[PDB]
Design a protein around this ligand. Sequence first.
Ligand code: MG
Length: 150
Amino acid sequence: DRPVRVLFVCLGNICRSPMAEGIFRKLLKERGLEDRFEVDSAGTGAWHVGEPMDPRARRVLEEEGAYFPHVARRLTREDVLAYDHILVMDRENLEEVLRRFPEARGKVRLVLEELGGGEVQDPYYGDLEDFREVYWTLEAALQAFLDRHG
Ligand SMILES: [Mg+2]
């Protein structure tokens, strides 16, 4: 069986989802699982296509050694077909994915389901500390994802 494909999804793909991808990439390295997983992140919207992640996101990832070259892009029908796990940040993201691609019925779910449910709050209107809070919330969810899938 081929490597498991994971796609993190938020609205703009410049804050929460790219941070989730950076953290995941870091964990794959520490656990020696780079040969078993593939990861990327995308947004439901197209407002930021082609842009790098938010400066606050880049800063926090650099602080934790989880930065990577990210380019924001918008989720496509191909993504829904190709990825095995479509992990969204909150319920609005979840409803939006299902609206455009009902075909993702079984594989899309809240990233925090790994910890029994919840939504990762949007830090866009906050400051660096809100971005750090998002980082650790995502870090906890992904360590659990790898314990169960790794
Ligand atoms: Mg990418």
